[PDB]
C-alpha cells in the first residue's frame, strides 16, 4: 500500500519449559493504584472461609412439610479458588482482595508477550485473571 513505511519485526518463541505460571492482576481505574508508592507488598491466599459453616437443607404430605430440615456443611477446600489478599506497605497501607474473573472460554485464550534480552518476544498463556479491589468494598 504505502510507498514508504517504518517496520519493526520480532522473532516469537513459545516456551514449553516454564516453571512459572503467568497471571493477570487487574485494578479499576477509579481506585487509582500507583506502584511508585509501593515500598513492600505481601500476596497470600485468604483461607478465612475454610472454617466458616453454611446451612444446607437435607412420610408426610408435601403441603404439610412446609418447615424443611437443615444441617451444616464444611465445603470442599479448593485453595485455588480462594481469593488473594494483597497487602501493600505494612499494617497501615492499602489492602486489596483478588477475585478470579470467570466469563470462561470460547475458541480463544489470552497470552502474555514479554521481550527477552536477545530482542525476541516469548509468549506465555495466561493461567488466571484476577480483579483486585480495596478490601473496604467487600463485605
Amino acid at each position: 500500500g504505502p510507498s514508504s513505511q517504518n517496520v519493526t519485526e520480532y522473532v516469537v518463541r513459545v516456551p514449553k519449559n516454564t516453571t512459572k505460571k503467568y497471571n493477570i492482576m487487574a485494578f479499576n481505574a477509579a481506585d487509582k493504584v500507583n506502584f511508585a508508592t509501593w515500598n513492600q507488598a505481601r500476596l497470600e491466599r485468604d483461607l478465612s472461609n475454610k472454617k466458616i459453616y453454611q446451612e444446607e437443607e437435607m412420610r408426610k404430605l408435601r403441603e404439610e412439610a412446609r418447615r424443611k430440615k437443615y444441617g451444616i456443611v464444611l465445603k470442599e477446600f479448593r485453595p485455588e479458588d480462594q481469593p488473594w489478599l494483597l497487602r501493600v506497605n505494612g499494617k497501615s497501607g492499602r489492602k486489596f482482595k483478588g477475585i478470579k474473573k470467570g466469563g470462561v472460554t470460547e475458541n480463544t485464550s489470552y497470552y502474555i508477550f514479554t521481550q527477552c534480552p536477545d530482542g525476541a518476544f516469548e509468549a506465555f498463556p495466561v493461567h488466571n485473571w484476577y480483579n483486585f479491589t480495596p478490601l473496604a468494598r467487600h463485605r
Binding site: 517504518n6 519485526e9 492482576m25 479499576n28 500476596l43
Partner: protein, 118 residues
C-alpha cells in the same frame, strides 16, 4: 525475599508487556514447535497516522498440517492480522507464581490486541 512476599522490581521498573487474545487453532499450532521453540514473527508497520500489526508463522510450522494438506497454491505463510484494543480504562499487571511458590510482579500491560484467524 521471604515467604508470602511479592517481588516488585518489575512493576516499578515499568517493564512493559503485551496481552494478546489468540485463536485456539493457532496456539495449538504453536505447541508443535521444536528446537529453539520459535513459531514465527511479529511485524509492526507504521505509516502516516496508521499502524498495522500482524503475526506470521515460520516456514517449519507453516508446513505442518492437520488431516487436509491445504489447497490452492500452498502460497506463502499467511499473515494473521492483529486488531488493536485499548487498555487506558484499567491497570493490568502481570504476576507470576513459580514452582517454588515465589511470587513476583513481572510487568505492566502496555498494549492489548486480538489475533484474528488468517
Amino acid at each position: 525475599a521471604e515467604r508470602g512476599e511479592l517481588d516488585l522490581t518489575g512493576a516499578k521498573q515499568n517493564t512493559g508487556v503485551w496481552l494478546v487474545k489468540v485463536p485456539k487453532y493457532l496456539s495449538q499450532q504453536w505447541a508443535k514447535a521444536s528446537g529453539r521453540g520459535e513459531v514465527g514473527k511479529l511485524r509492526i508497520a507504521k505509516t502516516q497516522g496508521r499502524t498495522e500489526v500482524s503475526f506470521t508463522l515460520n516456514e517449519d510450522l507453516a508446513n505442518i498440517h492437520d488431516i487436509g494438506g491445504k489447497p490452492a497454491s500452498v502460497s506463502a505463510p499467511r499473515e494473521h492480522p492483529f486488531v488493536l484494543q485499548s487498555v487506558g480504562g484499567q491497570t493490568l499487571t502481570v504476576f507470576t507464581e513459580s514452582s517454588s511458590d515465589k511470587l513476583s510482579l513481572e510487568g505492566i500491560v502496555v498494549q492489548r490486541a486480538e489475533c484474528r484467524p488468517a
